[PDB]
Amino acid sequence: MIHELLLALSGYPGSIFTWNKRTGLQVSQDIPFLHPGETSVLNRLCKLGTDYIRFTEFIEQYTGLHGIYLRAFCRGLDSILQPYRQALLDLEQEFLADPHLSISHINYSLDQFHLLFPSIMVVVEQIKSQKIHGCQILETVYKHSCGGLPPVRSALEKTLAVCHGVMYKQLSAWM
Amino acid sequence: KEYMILISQLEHLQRQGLLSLQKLWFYIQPTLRTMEVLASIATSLNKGECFGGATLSLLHDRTFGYTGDSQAQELCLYLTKAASAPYFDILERWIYRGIINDPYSEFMVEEHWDQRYTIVQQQIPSFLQKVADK
Amino acid sequence: VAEYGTYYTRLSHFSLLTVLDSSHSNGLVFQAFTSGLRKYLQYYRACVLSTPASLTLLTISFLFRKLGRQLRYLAELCCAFPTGVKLLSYLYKEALENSSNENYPVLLSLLKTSCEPYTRFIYDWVYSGVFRDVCGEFMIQVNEDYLGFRDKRYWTHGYVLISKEVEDCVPVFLKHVANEIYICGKTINLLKLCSLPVLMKYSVTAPMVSHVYLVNKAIVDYYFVELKMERHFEAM
Amino acid sequence: IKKYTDQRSLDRAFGLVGQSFCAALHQELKEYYRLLSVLHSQLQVESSLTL
């Protein structure tokens, strides 16, 4: 389970964790010698690694429409994956400390992330449905860091900060 | 010889293996580009068998064909000028004493009413032909 | 991550084939891109030496998350195939862009090394008259020296780019200075033989303005004492 | 060079210039010995010991 759940969490397909394109990555239903009860919470644990590779695809499309602020929004959001990925490294040594680890601590470490990750997905989704470019992103992300939820307005403040720097490229050379 | 010193200091770490195949190879990476330009000089001098000043002109084409990588033509530039160091000790003898002694002639000479036209270009200078006339 | 290691064997495949001890028709400038390119390759080699400890495949893939975005740009700019002065404009375009804040300094690093042969033929052409390009790709001129004409020392000398008429792609911009290193390169030897990528752009400009003015204040003196031009005007 | 210093024997044979010629080759015989002490002193107390 222990290394095997870190790599379903990265979003990459497993055999036990089937990818169906209709739903993203999800645990396959009713697998024998596991009570069905523990898989329902497990489906929710897959939902943070599903939206995370619905996230790298928003990166890689514009890295490696068009807009010089699109890839500036990519470097706004990568530091939000920075505490995320740091908690992926925080679970690894816990499993060397003891390798009889149950999934209830794993569920607990990820509840911080559960209200941070759909709120950034909905943000990029309104961006890609209005087909925005340039400086008129910064006002859409500003009234989004006007937002509630204290983790999430800070998250949306780092995404605000990087593409305000590309505004500063222009306004430093113009003035 | 100067390469062999650095290797014997690597051989002093090599008393037991703490160096992998990559580790010593990483020290040879800046030196890779160096060792192949000294190869191309050495084989070009072995093939045509030039002598005197036509060697030094051959070394200048080697400076032209490498062009770019200015740090590593700079070393072979010191090679063609160290080669011009015996070409300088023979040169002063024709112009400041007259009496010239060359080992087997390495600096062009033809010794002198009139007495012969004279022409001197036999070894060929490594610069333009107006210097041979002068 | 095997695919991440596949773009490292493209760089080393491209650098060993663009050396000019295997060619002498391809650009000097084309060689000059590799002298900077080989410094990122050894940088990789100490970082591959630093990947242990690996307790999982994530501590390493996340370590190269940052180098990954960059390697995909920095690998596939080569793929088209830009060569010569057209490659020197292809890195300068990419150096004008910044967006990505770690793909910006490596293309900045390449730009300083790759202009080294290019810039070399400039300062020698306006201080002595020797344009030392006679080998490899890029515009080769030596100019058709005439002593029979004395009218600027020349009567044939093409332009410095003999089909496009353009010079480009080095700090300043060379869309003014280029037409004037032309006119001063004829006359320097008439004396003789009978933060931002835009910020650094504005520090080169005034030096390139200074040397043409320094060369103009030598040929103006030469004119006054040797033409006696005012005397010809008076006589006309 | 070691046998050639043995050929000059007799101080006066035919030529004074003859034995001064290999008197020089006896000075340059000696310089090769002064080396061998310096590479020897590493060996023990008085590197990587391989040939």
Side-chain angles (χ1 to χ4, degrees):
Chain A
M1 190 274 291
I2 53 161
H3 172 94
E4 296 108 284
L5 174 50
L6 300 161
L7 309 192
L9 186 36
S10 73
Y12 286 86
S15 308
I16 299 300
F17 311 102
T18 307
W19 176 277
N20 165 27
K21 301 191 187 159
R22 309 192 172 281
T23 64
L25 195 73
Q26 301 187 320
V27 197
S28 185
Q29 292 179 106
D30 202 8
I31 304 184
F33 299 106
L34 190 77
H35 176 268
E38 298 183 299
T39 321
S40 46
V41 54
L42 254 165
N43 291 116
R44 302 299 84 152
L45 288 211
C46 284
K47 171 179 196 187
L48 301 167
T50 292
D51 59 8
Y52 173 47
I53 186 173
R54 291 299 185 235
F55 223 26
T56 46
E57 69 191 28
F58 171 84
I59 302 168
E60 70 184 35
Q61 161 74 183
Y62 305 118
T63 303
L65 314 184
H66 53 271
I68 84 192
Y69 278 89
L70 304 181
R71 176 157 176 150
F73 212 94
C74 289
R75 281 61 182 166
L77 62 81
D78 55 347
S79 289
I80 291 64
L81 309 171
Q82 184 62 257
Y84 182 78
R85 287 176 276 103
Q86 184 58 50
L88 307 183
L89 170 50
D90 301 339
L91 294 163
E92 175 62 48
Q93 55 70 36
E94 189 49 78
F95 307 150
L96 194 57
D98 172 51
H100 200 249
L101 225 307
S102 184
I103 55 164
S104 302
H105 172 271
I106 314 184
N107 286 351
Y108 144 88
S109 191
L110 276 174
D111 306 332
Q112 208 286 331
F113 290 125
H114 197 261
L115 282 75
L116 177 50
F117 279 41
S119 68
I120 197 49
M121 191 270 170
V122 72
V123 168
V124 294
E125 183 64 64
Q126 176 275 318
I127 286 157
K128 280 194 296 188
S129 184
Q130 288 311 285
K131 286 72 176 176
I132 324 189
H133 50 298
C135 284
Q136 56 160 282
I137 313 187
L138 198 61
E139 163 71 312
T140 21
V141 85
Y142 174 79
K143 301 315 302 170
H144 286 191
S145 54
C146 197
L149 309 180
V152 188
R153 72 193 65 210
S154 51
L156 281 305
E157 205 266 304
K158 302 295 318 186
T159 61
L160 195 159
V162 178
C163 49
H164 124 275
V166 179
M167 186 270 281
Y168 256 77
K169 203 296 176 209
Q170 307 188 318
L171 195 124
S172 50
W174 174 241
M175 305 273 299
Chain B
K1 171 189 306 192
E2 165 173 89
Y3 177 49
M4 283 164 183
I5 293 327
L6 307 151
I7 287 161
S8 72
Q9 288 178 105
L10 284 170
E11 194 186 56
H12 212 226
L13 192 48
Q14 201 46 264
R15 49 180 177 232
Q16 70 290 315
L18 296 169
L19 299 80
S20 60
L21 304 71
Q22 299 188 79
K23 177 59 146 174
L24 72 159
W25 185 43
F26 162 47
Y27 301 139
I28 294 165
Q29 291 292 140
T31 313
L32 193 63
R33 45 164 181 281
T34 292
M35 278 289 183
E36 69 209 52
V37 288
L38 271 276
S40 55
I41 294 158
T43 197
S44 68
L45 293 167
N46 204 22
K47 283 299 180 302
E49 297 283 281
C50 38
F51 185 100
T55 288
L56 310 166
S57 183
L58 185 55
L59 264 292
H60 299 169
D61 296 358
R62 298 260 70 68
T63 314
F64 298 134
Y66 188 37
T67 35
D69 304 353
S70 177
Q71 67 296 324
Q73 55 203 64
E74 161 50 48
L75 64 92
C76 48
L77 269 178
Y78 167 79
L79 260 303
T80 193
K81 296 307 308 176
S84 298
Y87 186 63
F88 293 153
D89 286 11
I90 71 184
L91 189 61
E92 58 197 306
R93 317 197 192 181
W94 171 251
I95 194 169
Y96 283 152
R97 313 295 303 165
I99 204 181
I100 185 180
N101 178 64
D102 298 359
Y104 300 100
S105 188
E106 175 188 327
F107 158 60
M108 55 179 171
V109 65
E110 290 302 298
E111 56 161 67
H112 297 292
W113 61 103
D114 60 359
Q115 67 276 124
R116 66 177 299 163
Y117 286 136
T118 352
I119 167 69
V120 66
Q121 61 177 317
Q122 313 298 296
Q123 307 300 309
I124 313 180
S126 39
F127 310 105
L128 71 166
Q129 295 290 270
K130 286 315 293 169
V131 89
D133 293 325
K134 284 297 177 165
Chain C
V1 53
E3 165 79 297
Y4 166 78
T6 309
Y7 287 130
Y8 187 62
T9 234
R10 290 191 210 265
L11 295 188
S12 34
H13 203 271
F14 168 74
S15 48
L16 292 165
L17 298 172
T18 187
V19 75
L20 300 171
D21 304 316
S22 310
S23 193
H24 304 282
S25 58
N26 292 126
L28 305 182
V29 178
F30 199 34
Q31 171 66 325
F33 182 59
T34 324
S35 64
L37 187 49
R38 280 168 313 190
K39 306 301 302 188
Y40 182 49
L41 300 172
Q42 62 191 258
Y43 181 97
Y44 194 104
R45 285 175 186 113
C47 188
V48 148
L49 183 33
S50 180
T51 45
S54 188
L55 263 169
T56 180
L57 287 163
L58 292 181
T59 60
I60 311 308
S61 79
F62 296 155
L63 183 69
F64 292 126
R65 192 178 172 80
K66 177 175 58 154
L67 295 306
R69 302 179 199 200
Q70 171 189 346
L71 189 39
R72 298 194 293 168
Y73 208 86
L74 197 263
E76 300 292 294
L77 56 98
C78 175
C79 316
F81 296 93
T83 55
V85 56
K86 197 261 157 175
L87 176 129
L88 189 47
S89 321
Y90 210 82
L91 59 83
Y92 185 63
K93 199 259 180 179
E94 285 165 302
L96 273 158
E97 299 181 297
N98 39 350
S99 289
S100 45
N101 309 328
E102 65 298 296
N103 175 55
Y104 167 79
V106 68
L107 289 163
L108 197 46
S109 294
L110 288 158
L111 172 61
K112 67 170 55 166
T113 60
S114 201
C115 297
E116 301 171 305
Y118 189 102
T119 60
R120 262 186 286 141
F121 302 133
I122 311 316
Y123 62 84
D124 67 2
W125 166 249
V126 297
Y127 302 159
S128 71
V130 176
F131 196 107
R132 191 202 306 150
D133 187 49
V134 289
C135 215
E137 207 189 302
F138 175 60
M139 165 59 181
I140 305 170
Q141 67 176 40
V142 81
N143 318 90
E144 306 308 304
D145 172 37
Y146 289 93
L147 297 82
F149 296 129
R150 167 52 176 71
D151 295 11
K152 63 287 182 54
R153 210 80 288 279
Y154 287 125
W155 172 85
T156 300
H157 56 245
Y159 184 80
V160 308
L161 214 308
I162 197 154
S163 210
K164 305 203 171 177
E165 290 199 346
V166 61
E167 291 194 284
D168 193 1
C169 66
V170 178
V172 74
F173 190 35
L174 307 182
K175 302 310 197 65
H176 49 302
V177 174
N179 300 324
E180 302 190 278
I181 57 193
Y182 171 66
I183 62 168
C184 89
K186 308 313 146 183
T187 50
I188 178 66
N189 79 97
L190 183 54
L191 311 159
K192 307 295 163 186
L193 50 136
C194 63
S195 194
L196 259 61
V198 304
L199 171 54
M200 70 193 192
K201 185 167 74 191
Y202 296 134
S203 55
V204 189
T205 293
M208 311 276 295
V209 156
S210 187
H211 63 79
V212 38
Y213 299 154
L214 289 159
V215 163
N216 292 351
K217 60 168 64 57
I219 195 71
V220 75
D221 296 346
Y222 173 87
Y223 290 11
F224 298 138
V225 308
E226 298 200 337
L227 299 211
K228 310 308 182 178
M229 62 287 162
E230 165 158 63
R231 199 188 291 197
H232 293 283
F233 307 162
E234 179 176 53
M236 277 177 298
Chain D
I1 182 162
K2 184 71 187 145
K3 62 198 307 300
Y4 201 16
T5 46
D6 295 313
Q7 295 198 262
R8 66 188 210 255
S9 48
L10 285 181
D11 186 36
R12 179 44 160 189
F14 181 96
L16 181 62
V17 194
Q19 299 59 283
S20 73
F21 179 74
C22 304
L25 305 178
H26 180 38
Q27 299 307 95
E28 295 178 63
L29 184 90
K30 182 165 61 51
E31 291 330 271
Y32 177 94
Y33 306 154
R34 188 180 302 204
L35 179 59
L36 298 173
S37 59
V38 171
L39 62 100
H40 169 62
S41 68
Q42 44 195 7
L43 179 61
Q44 78 305 274
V45 181
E46 62 164 50
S47 63
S48 166
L49 284 53
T50 185
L51 312 167

